[PDB]
Design a protein around this ligand. Structure first.
Ligand SMILES: Nc1nc2c(ncn2[C@@H]2O[C@H](COP(=O)(O)OP(=O)(O)NP(=O)(O)O)[C@@H](O)[C@H]2O)c(=O)[nH]1
Ligand SMILES: [Mg+2]
Lengths: 130, 17, 997, 206
């Protein structure tokens, strides 16, 4: 007898993932301002093979960074850190419409920062090949 | 059962396998 | 500038323009809202706005605007009521009373504008505080009379009485003078007989619940102060505990009332009071079992569902049960007919204790502590609660939190220890059962095995040693089996950590079974090579935890061993720690230092120390030779890091060995201070070559770390040293030469605040032995540090705190150092103390006031000598007026008590004739005038200019009382508080300062 | 679908810093006292959809109080803030609560003890009991370390929506654009300053 019983990230691959602290430079006040702390991910779209940075804040999971790892971006060190990278971004859409930012990203150790730059450059080659 | 205990405690794998 | 029309008082107030601004502020958004906000603040703060308040209340259609109008009116009643012509006072009263009457008539308004009506009620209560009953004797009689005419008026009168009771009894302490509070309290006490009749009649006869609830809400306030006879010599308990517990409208407030009833002051030897106390508890639990939920109900699930007000009700039920049972449960323990009631009340608490809600659990846990403690000491009680305590054991065990929360764990442990003593057999059975269900997988999870391990570990020391042995063995065997059962590093890591946590909690067991203790330690060493996240930290933390409690068994030669185990540890130390991070190596060395300190044979202790420090001393000797050869080698990040880790290792071992560390300190001391100078030069050179930004670079930050760890090492030893002669003769001279000038001659951004901290410790322990050294410390750090911190309250926060800690200890231990200061520098010392008064930073404020106090004491101890006489002439009235300034400015309320104490000391000096010279200039007042007369004259002028709205009579009475009371700190503080109230208004009563007779 | 939230408490307790942290992720170290009130929309993404809080960040210093309890009219939830390093700020919690519930007689309220990141805690856990009889939710929080910084809004969200299982979820992450010399020299300039300005809090773990 039959008895009847009672994020827009799905199409992507995770190349790299590291916990970091993201800063944005406020040129008016000439000071850095935190933008978020959490997992920074390199996500490769399976339909386009191009990679982006997606970073979310812990707990609230709100996006504090979303932009392509452009081949033209360049990671420069910060004067007061051996575990951070500074670079300008021309179109980040974490706060709505695209906008330009001077970002700084800090990690737990120099090696994680060096590894980040390693992956950051691998990802650039991928966005180059397409 | 004291010697049993140290015996079994020694078998606790330091490499977790 | 369009909405800014209302700010122009030349023209009549355009109500319509007001309602636009108000609407734009509350319902608008963005810039228009922000601009409306500024306009409303400016309009509200106009000292004439109250005059245009009568217009708004009559002709405005916007309830928000009328609310704002009453706020403007409230500011006026509170602060300038007595300054007005008597005409306005009567007028304001009239159209507030009338406005409330009219709103209560329109049932449409009475229900739609509860906010506006409550605000008007509160405004009426402010008038009462000014005018009642001396200028309004008929208020209460006319209130009771008007109540009978309209249900809406009667209900609102209950709101007025509620607010009045709150303003007089609950929130008067700091808002009125003592005399005015007592006046209003007595006034309400007189006329409460008739207030209560009205309240009791409504509760017995009334039908509309809105009026019932409002009457019960006022009753809640009355119970805070009314005599107990109004509750026990009437039928009101019967109504609360039966009638009003049935309807959910009145249930919440009734339950809160009965909670306060359980706190009333009652005879305690009358047997009919005890019956009535039993009776209303019996009725309340009955209504709950029949109208709300039975004692079997799952309150955990009810609370989680969060339907309606269930959560607040279960919270209030927990408060009611715990409050009543903490005070009255004895009334239920002897009568056999009250046993079911006693255990049902506690069974409700059991069910309440299962709710997932941290703060609610803490409330019930506090009661359980109250209970099990009483069952531990009180004869013939524990058998009553056998089944309750059995359930409680499982509840505590299943909700055990992580020990590292810290406060909640200690509370849980305390209750569970008591419960273990009460029935150790039942506790053992529960824990083994819980563990069996972890093994069979029916309750297995990382969270559940951790919770159980914490619970098992929390009861160590409660069982007999023989029972504990058998229990511990069973637990470890089972846990070991659970680990073998599981697969994967993650699972095996959780169980391994829990195994090690438990063993660390049973040192009595470890101390009696060396073979086992050895196996544990050696197994921890194996875990120190495992890289899985958390393992190494767990291994090191368990190592030092076991050592702290079993150290004696590592220093002795255990039977069947060739050497004390400490020697074995030091041998393989390189291999043991090879895979650990630096911070973990330091913990390991610190643990060894704990053991070595147990060796009291000096020659052997020093040898163990030498062997332990072998690796860091060899690394040290090497880089000391390399450093001196090529100073640029210190620019190598790796060399700087090696150096810092060597010093940190010495700090770690010194932290646990204290005085015993001296021989190792002597091995490195002189080369360490040379290193300090060398890195100091490099820091200075980098700042010269790259600017202040260099202080942010990793290079320089690494160099300053070396300096800071050297200072920390020296501070650590001196703070614990036993031979102070050696500290003085060997350590201090080189230390001061190495650090003081470097600090003085670096730019502010390169000065290490740790230098001040290190110096504070030197002065603390050997200050009395190096007076010339203390002088050298002040010269090198006083003026240059003061100039860093006397421009604002923000910059250099670390230097700020250490600066005043250092001055404090010098003022205590070597006051002579300040007597040698030139007069210009001693003036800066005084300026610095007063500067500390003005900080809101508690660290600075508290020390500034203590320095001032100790400084006055130091001067007083000197007697009638020139320096003391000159000090009072120069700085007495500076300290009096600076203390008065922060006392009265409303921005330093956190320091009232210490400000009051300092002020009382200053005043007491004059009225004890401790100041031998006149504090005045002989041309300022006639000769022979006492300092008493002059002090009172100076203060009167000071307060008259600082608070010109006070009458001379107020000032004169305040000072006469403050002076007479300078030997009674509690009364003295009351008079200051009364003064702080009076300066906030106009026309304060000068007789208030006679409150203390 | 927006709720008015009033945020009250003594001056210096961290109300504005707490809100700023939620609005931009920034941690402001300066104490710039709020004047009257500052309204800030704040949106969270939940499994029940987005919820908007209109946060009325009010002033705690009396001389900057503005409309005082006039800011509370028609509020639907509230947060009372104090500073666990300042006993006086906890002493004043009953005063803030009094003035709040006289206007808002039945709203969910969270009591927050801020600044638990500081070692020298002055208001001990066991002293904090005021919330029990007043049926407030209590949380230890730190705007500096983000300890429990989301709990006040999650709890209020659940109370306002009537769903105890409501959860914060990850907002959707749209694909970013794959994007001039006319602006080059202006970025290389702004980037030169950014490199030579040290990142704050370099001793922090992360
Ligand atoms: N250590 C620490 N400091 C904090 C924390 N939160 C805020 N602060 C600091 O406390 C000070 C006051 O911050 P603020 O937000 O302006 O307080 P406020 O309650 O808004 N003051 P007001 O009522 O006058 O507007 C600031 O310096 C801030 O950096 C915290 O969580 N931890
Ligand atoms: Mg603010």
């Amino acid at each position: 007898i039959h008895f009847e019983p009672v994020t827009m990230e799905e199409d992507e691959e995770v190349l790299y993932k590291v916990r970091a602290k993201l800063f944005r430079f406020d040129a008016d006040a000439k000071e850095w301002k935190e933008r978020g702390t959490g997992d920074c991910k390199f996500l490769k779209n399976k339909k386009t093979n191009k990679v982006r940075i997606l970073m979310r804040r812990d707990k609230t999971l709100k996006i504090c960074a979303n932009h392509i790892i452009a081949p033209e971006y360049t990671l420069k060190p910060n004067v007061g850190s051996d575990r951070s990278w500074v670079y300008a971004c021309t179109a980040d859409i974490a706060e709505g419409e695209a906008e330009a930012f001077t970002f700084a990203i800090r990690f737990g150790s120099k090696e994680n920062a060096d590894k980040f730059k390693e992956e950051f450059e691998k990802a650039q080659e991928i966005n180059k090949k397409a | 059962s004291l010697q049993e205990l140290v015996q079994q405690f020694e078998a606790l794998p330091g490499d977790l396998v | 500038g369009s909405m800014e029309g209302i700010l122009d008082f030349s023209n009549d107030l355009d109500i319509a323009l007001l309602d636009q601004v108000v609407s734009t502020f509350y319902q608008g958004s963005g810039v228009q809202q922000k601009q409306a906000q500024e306009i409303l603040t400016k309009f509200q703060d106009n000292p004439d706005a109250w005059q245009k308040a009568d217009q708004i209340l009559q002709f405005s259609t916007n309830p928000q605007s009328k609310f704002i109008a009453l706020s403007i009116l409230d500011k006026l009643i509170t602060r300038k009521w007595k300054l007005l012509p008597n005409d306005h006072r009567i007028g304001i009263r009239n159209f507030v009373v009338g406005m409330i009457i009219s709103m209560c008539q329109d049932d449409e308004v009475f229900k739609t504008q509860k906010n506006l009506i409550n605000k008007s009620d509160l405004t009426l209560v402010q008038i009462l505080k000014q005018e009642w009953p001396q200028n309004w004797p008929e208020f209460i009689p006319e209130l009771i009379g008007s109540s009978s005419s309209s249900v809406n008026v009667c209900e609102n009168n209950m709101i007025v009485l509620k607010l009045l009771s709150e303003e007089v009894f609950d929130f008067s302490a700091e808002q009125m003078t003592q005399a005015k509070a007592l006046h209003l309290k007595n006034s309400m006490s007189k006329e409460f007989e008739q207030i209560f009749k009205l309240c009791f009649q409504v509760l017995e006869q009334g039908s509309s619940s809105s009026l019932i609830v409002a009457t019960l809400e006022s009753l809640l306030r009355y119970l805070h102060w009314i005599p107990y006879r109004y509750i026990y010599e009437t039928n009101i308990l019967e109504l609360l505990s039966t009638k009003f517990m049935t309807s959910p409208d009145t249930r919440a407030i009734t339950l809160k009332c009965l909670t306060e009833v359980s706190n009333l002051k009652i005879p305690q030897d009358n047997d009919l009071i005890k019956r009535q106390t039993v009776l209303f508890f019996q009725n309340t639990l009955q209504q709950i079992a029949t109208s709300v939920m039975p004692v079997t109900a799952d309150l955990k699930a009810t609370y989680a569902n969060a339907n309606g007000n269930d959560q607040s009700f279960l919270q209030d039920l927990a408060m009611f049960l715990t409050t009543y049972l903490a005070r009255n449960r004895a009334l239920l323990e002897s009568d056999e007919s009250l046993r079911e009631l006693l255990l049902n009340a506690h069974q409700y608490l059991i069910q309440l204790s299962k709710i997932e809600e941290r703060e609610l659990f803490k409330t019930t846990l506090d009661y359980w502590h109250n209970l099990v403690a009483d069952l531990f000491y009180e004869p013939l009680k524990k058998h009553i609660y056998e089944e309750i305590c059995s359930q409680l054991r499982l509840v505590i065990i299943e909700n055990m939190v992580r020990p590292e929360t810290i406060q909640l764990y200690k509370s849980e442990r305390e209750v569970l220890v008591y419960l273990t003593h009460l029935n150790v057999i039942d506790t053992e059975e529960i824990m083994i059962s819980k563990l069996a269900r972890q093994i069979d997988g029916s309750e297995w999870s990382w969270h559940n095995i951790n919770t159980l391990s914490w619970a098992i570990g929390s009861i160590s020391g409660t069982m007999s040693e023989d029972t504990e042995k058998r229990f511990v063995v069973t637990v470890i065997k089972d846990l070991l089996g659970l680990c073998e059962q599981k697969r994967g590093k993650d699972n095996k890591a959780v169980v391994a950590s829990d195994i090690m946590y438990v063993v660390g909690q049973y040192p009595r067991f470890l101390k009696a079974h060396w073979n086992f203790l050895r196996t544990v330690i050696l197994k921890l060493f194996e875990f120190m090579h495992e890289t899985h996240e958390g393992v190494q930290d767990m291994a090191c933390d368990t190592f030092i935890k076991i050592v702290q409690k079993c150290k004696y068994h590592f220093v002795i030669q255990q039977p069947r061993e060739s050497e004390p185990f400490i020697q074995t540890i030091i041998r393989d130390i390189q291999k043991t720690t090879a895979d650990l991070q630096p911070q973990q190596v330091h913990t390991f060395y610190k643990a060894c230092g704990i053991i070595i300190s147990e060796e009291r044979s000096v020659a052997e202790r020093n040898r163990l120390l030498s062997d332990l420090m072998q690796l860091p001393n060899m690394a040290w000797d090497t880089i000391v030779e390399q450093s001196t050869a090529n100073p640029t080698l210190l620019l190598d990040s790796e060399t700087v890091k090696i150096i810092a880790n060597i010093i940190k290792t010495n700090v770690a071992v010194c932290t646990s060995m204290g005085a015993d560390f001296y021989p190792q300190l002597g091995h490195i001391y002189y080369n360490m201070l040379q290193l300090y100078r060398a890195v100091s030069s490099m820091i200075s050179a980098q700042v010269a070559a790259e600017g202040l930004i260099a202080t942010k670079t990793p290079k320089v930050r690494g160099l300053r770390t070396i300096k800071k760890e050297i200072l920390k090492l020296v501070e650590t030893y001196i703070s614990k040293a036993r031979n102070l002669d050696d500290v003085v003769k060997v350590l201090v001279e080189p230390l001061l030469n190495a650090v003081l000038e470097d600090y003085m001659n670096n730019v502010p951004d390169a000065r290490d605040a740790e230098v001040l901290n290190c110096m504070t410790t030197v002065v603390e322990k050997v200050g009395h032995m190096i007076p010339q050294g203390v002088i050298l410390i002040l010269q090198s750090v006083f003026e240059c540090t003061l100039d860093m911190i006397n421009k604002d309250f923000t910059e250099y926060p670390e230097h700020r705190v250490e600066f005043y800690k250092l001055l404090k200890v010098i003022n205590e231990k070597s006051f002579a150092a300040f007597l040698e200061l030139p007069p210009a520098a001693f003036k800066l010392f005084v300026d610095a103390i007063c500067w500390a008064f003005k900080h809101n930073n508690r660290d600075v404020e508290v020390n500034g006031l203590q320095i001032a106090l100790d400084l006055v004491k130091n001067i007083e101890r000197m007697g009638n000598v020139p320096f003391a006489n000159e000090f009072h002439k120069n700085y007495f009235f500076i300290f009096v007026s600076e203390t008065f300034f922060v006392l009265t400015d409303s921005d330093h309320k956190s320091g009232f008590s210490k400000q009051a104490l300092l002020l009382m000391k200053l005043i007491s000096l004059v009225y004890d004739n401790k100041i031998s010279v006149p504090l005045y200039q002989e041309a300022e007042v006639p000769q022979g005038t006492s300092n008493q007369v002059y002090l009172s004259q100076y203060l009167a002028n000071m307060l008259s200019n600082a608070f010109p709205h006070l009458t001379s009579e107020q000032i004169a009475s305040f000072l006469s009382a403050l002076t007479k009371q300078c030997k009674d700190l509690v009364v003295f503080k009351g008079t200051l508080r009364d003064f702080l109230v009076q300066i906030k208004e106009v026309g304060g009563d000068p007789t208030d300062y006679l409150f203390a007779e | 679908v927006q709720f008015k939230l009033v945020l009250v408490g003594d001056g210096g307790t961290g109300k504005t810093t707490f809100v700023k942290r939620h609005l931009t992720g920034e941690f402001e170290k300066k104490y710039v006292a709020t004047l009257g009130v500052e309204v800030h929309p704040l949106v969270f993404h939940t499994n029940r959809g987005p919820i908007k809080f209109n946060v009325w960040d009010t002033a705690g210093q009396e001389k900057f109080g503005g409309l005082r309890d006039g800011y509370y009219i028609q509020a639907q939830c509230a947060i009372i803030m104090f500073d666990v390093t300042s006993r006086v700020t906890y002493k004043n919690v009953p005063n803030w609560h009094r003035d709040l519930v006289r206007v808002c007689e039945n709203i969910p309220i969270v009591l927050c003890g801020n600044k638990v990141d500081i070692k020298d805690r002055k208001v001990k856990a066991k002293s904090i009991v005021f919330h029990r009889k007043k049926n407030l939710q209590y949380y230890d929080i730190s705007a500096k370390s983000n300890y429990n910084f989301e709990k006040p809004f999650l709890w209020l969200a659940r109370k306002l929506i009537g769903d105890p299982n409501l959860e914060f979820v990850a907002m959707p992450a749209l694909a970013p654009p794959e994007v001039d010399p006319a602006l080059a020299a202006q970025y290389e300039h702004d980037l030169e300053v950014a490199q030579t300005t040290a990142l704050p809090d370099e001793d922090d773990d992360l």
